Amino acid sequence: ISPIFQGGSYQLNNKSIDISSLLLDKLSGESQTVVMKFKADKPNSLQALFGLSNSKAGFKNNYFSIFMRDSGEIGVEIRDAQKGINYLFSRPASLWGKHKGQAVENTLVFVSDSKDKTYTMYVNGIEVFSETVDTFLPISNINGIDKATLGAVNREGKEHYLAKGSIDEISLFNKAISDQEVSTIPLSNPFQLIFQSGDSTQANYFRIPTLYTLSSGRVLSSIDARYGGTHDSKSKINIATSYSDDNGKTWSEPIFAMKFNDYEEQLVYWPRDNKLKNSQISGSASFIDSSIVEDKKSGKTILLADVMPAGIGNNNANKADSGFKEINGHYYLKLKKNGDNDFRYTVRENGVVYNETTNKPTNYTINDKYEVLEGGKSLTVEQYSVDFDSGSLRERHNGKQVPMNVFYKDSLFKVTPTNYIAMTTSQNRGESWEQFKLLPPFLGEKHNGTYLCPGQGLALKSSNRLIFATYTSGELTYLISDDSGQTWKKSSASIPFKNATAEAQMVELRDGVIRTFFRTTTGKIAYMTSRDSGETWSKVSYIDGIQQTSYGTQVSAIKYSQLIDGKEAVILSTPNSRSGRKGGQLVVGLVNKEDDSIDWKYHYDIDLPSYGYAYSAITELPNHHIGVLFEKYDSWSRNELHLSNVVQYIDLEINDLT
Numbered sequence: 001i002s003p004i005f006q007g008g009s010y011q012l013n014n015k016s017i018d019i020s021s022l023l024l025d026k027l028s029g030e031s032q033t034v035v036m037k038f039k040a041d042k043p044n045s046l047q048a049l050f051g052l053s054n055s056k057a058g059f060k061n062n063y064f065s066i067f068m069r070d071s072g073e074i075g076v077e078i079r080d081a082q083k084g085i086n087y088l089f090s091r092p093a094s095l096w097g098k099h100k101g102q103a104v105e106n107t108l109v110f111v112s113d114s115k116d117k118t119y120t121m122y123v124n125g126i127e128v129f130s131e132t133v134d135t136f137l138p139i140s141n142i143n144g145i146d147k148a149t150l151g152a153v154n155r156e157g158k159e160h161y162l163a164k165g166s167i168d169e170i171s172l173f174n175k176a177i178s179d180q181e182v183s184t185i186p187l188s189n190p191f192q193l194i195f196q197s198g199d200s201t202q203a204n205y206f207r208i209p210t211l212y213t214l215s216s217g218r219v220l221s222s223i224d225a226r227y228g229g230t231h232d233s234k235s236k237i238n239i240a241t242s243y244s245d246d247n248g249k250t251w252s253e254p255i256f257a258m259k260f261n262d263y264e265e266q267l268v269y270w271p272r273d274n275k276l277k278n279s280q281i282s283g284s285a286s287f288i289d290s291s292i293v294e295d296k297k298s299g300k301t302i303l304l305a306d307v308m309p310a311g312i313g314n315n316n317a318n319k320a321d322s323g324f325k326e327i328n329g330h331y332y333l334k335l336k337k338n339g340d341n342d343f344r345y346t347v348r349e350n351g352v353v354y355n356e357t358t359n360k361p362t363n364y365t366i367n368d369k370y371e372v373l374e375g376g377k378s379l380t381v382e383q384y385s386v387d388f389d390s391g392s393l394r395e396r397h398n399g400k401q402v403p404m405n406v407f408y409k410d411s412l413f414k415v416t417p418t419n420y421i422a423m424t425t426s427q428n429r430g431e432s433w434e435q436f437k438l439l440p441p442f443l444g445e446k447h448n449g450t451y452l453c454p455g456q457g458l459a460l461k462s463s464n465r466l467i468f469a470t471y472t473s474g475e476l477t478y479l480i481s482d483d484s485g486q487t488w489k490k491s492s493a494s495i496p497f498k499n500a501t502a503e504a505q506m507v508e509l510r511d512g513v514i515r516t517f518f519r520t521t522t523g524k525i526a527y528m529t530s531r532d533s534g535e536t537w538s539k540v541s542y543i544d545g546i547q548q549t550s551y552g553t554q555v556s557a558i559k560y561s562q563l564i565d566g567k568e569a570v571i572l573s574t575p576n577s578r579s580g581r582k583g584g585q586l587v588v589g590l591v592n593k594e595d596d597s598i599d600w601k602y603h604y605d606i607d608l609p610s611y612g613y614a615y616s617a618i619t620e621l622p623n624h625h626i627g628v629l630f631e632k633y634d635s636w637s638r639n640e641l642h643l644s645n646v647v648q649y650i651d652l653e654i655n656d657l658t
């Protein structure tokens with residue numbers, strides 16, 4: 001099934017190219033496919049790559065175009081004034097610009113299908129929109145079309161949306177090629193996907209990537225599998241993991257490290273229109289923000305994450321309560337029974353539910369999976385599913401029973417509606433994970449729980465010490481274990497910020513010397529240092545030479561194993577921008593032995609300064625390359641919510657960075 005037109009090596013230098021004679025008489029029938037391989041490493045603010053237009057006076061709104069923005073957004077317009085049709089379909093963050101200094105060849109496939117009345121856009125093997133309409137407009141059927149154009153749209157005789165870039169290949173087909181045929185078109189991607197829409201997680205969205213290189217050489221990744229769009233909360237989120245045994249070349253089908261069953265794992269297309277985009281799965285328990293470390297001694301992998309019950313709500317839930325009760329220097333999980341107005345129960349020794357009014361135990365116990373048992377018998381609740389069939393989000397029982405968990409909305413016994421920290425382990429390097437256990441309160445019975453810093457924990461090289469960074473108001477709270485994560489203690493480190501999202505990651509500069517880099521509210525990345533393996537912490541300093549936004553973004557960090565320019569090296573991954581989450585960089589710092597100060601000497605731009613880059617994970621691969629898994633979009637922006645397959649992985653060598 002051949003192209004009706006095929007052309008290549010077009011240079012778009014703010015001057016459109018007329019291909020009308022070559023293409024227009026070839027166009028026929030009402031279904032078309034455009035395949036285009038193009039580069040744009042210096043795009044204009046808004047530019048059309050391809051246009052079919054009525055160029056005549058008075059018909060300026062009769063055209064089809066494929067356009068892009070310098071934010072990385074791709075879209076089409078399909079307009080006919082006589083038909084009263086003005087379609088615009090687009091998706092932010094769909095493009096690559098540059099990789100290792102070279103312009104990326106993006107592969108774009110646009111399918112206009114008259115039979116299904118559907119327009120579908122793929123970029124780099126990723127479907128970025130699929131839109132069905134009541135009234136279909138074939139792109140060839142726009143009234144009075146007389147121009148086919150590359151690198152602009154001809155309107156009333158003038159070049160609109162002038163492009164800068166190149167089209168190394170463009171093909172057109174008088175057919176809507178199938179999704180399968182699309183999948184056979186060769187790609188030139190600079191990235192790969194570890195987690196993706198339609199995989200075993202069945203989440204359509206992903207956020208908060210982590211990466212960690214295990215001692216066997218296996219590289220492990222964890223991530224938020226996010227079901228209700230990309231929202232933090234309220235939502236349904238599980239923690240998924242995947243691993244690579246060949247230095248990041250291929251990755252295992254994901255499994256769950258932490259999951260709840262009160263709501264079905266559904267692949268859902270979350271609305272992106274302004275009226276509905278803030279719809280939230282509101283009755284589901286959820287995890288969020290994971291962190292990984294490996295323990296030399298037991299050989300176990302440890303994964304922590306925040307846990308939230310279904311009853312959680314932002315503010316007034318639950319600052320001023322840890323969710324635990326202290327009774328004799330020991331902490332016990334509090335529980336409220338269906339119909340009580342306060343928390344009159346605790347989960348004492350061996351999950352026995354006690355009544356704190358009468359100190360009498362009950363016939364109810366809580367098992368290992370935080371599930372409710374009555375007289376030894378497994379209680380259940382009915383699962384929920386969500387849908388937008390009514391034109392707004394509904395959450396409804398689906399007929400399926402699942403074990404009753406104290407984190408669920410429908411549970412007989414409920415935990416305090418606050419945030420907790422959970423821990424699970426794997427003894428097979430990520431092939432399976434245990435049931436999670438809740439960590440105890442660290443800042444007291446009355447303090448709500450600290451917030452886990454997503455990314456990596458720190459395994460000190462010269463001892464058995466494990467450290468996970470967490471944050472809360474006014475300090476970082478480091479969690480320290482010297483016994484394979486069986487027992488934890490805290491080390492508080494004051495920071496000059498109140499209610500900051502002080503996401504912190506650590507590197508060991510040398511034996512027992514830890515530097516922690518963290519997110520602040522000042523527009524600069526901060527850091528502090530410990531010289532006694534985390535017991536005590538220095539005052540806070542800031543990095544100059546890198547800019548963040550006022551609200552800041554997570555920073556990932558590693559100690560590189562090899563010397564660079566003869567010096568110890570640390571590599572930071574972060575957006576470099578004071579406007580938004582974009583301009584991703586790896587910044588290579590060299591340590592000064594005189595004082596452990598760091599000279600930030602090399603900045604590697606991940607992609608264009610204007611292209612999205614948010615939360616990130618980096619790890620030194622066993623072959624000394626650098627693996628980077630990152631949110632390739634602006635995960636703060638209210639315009640880039642609910643995008644699929646934007647968390648992407650790349651492989652880099654140190655020479656690429658210098």
Ligand SMILES: COc1ccc(CNCCS(=O)(=O)O)cc1
Binds near residue numbers: 233288307419635
């Ligand atoms: C336990 O519940 C939690 C835990 C952490 C958070 C913060 N996540 C910030 C991400 S962002 O800066 O908005 O992109 C929100 C809810």
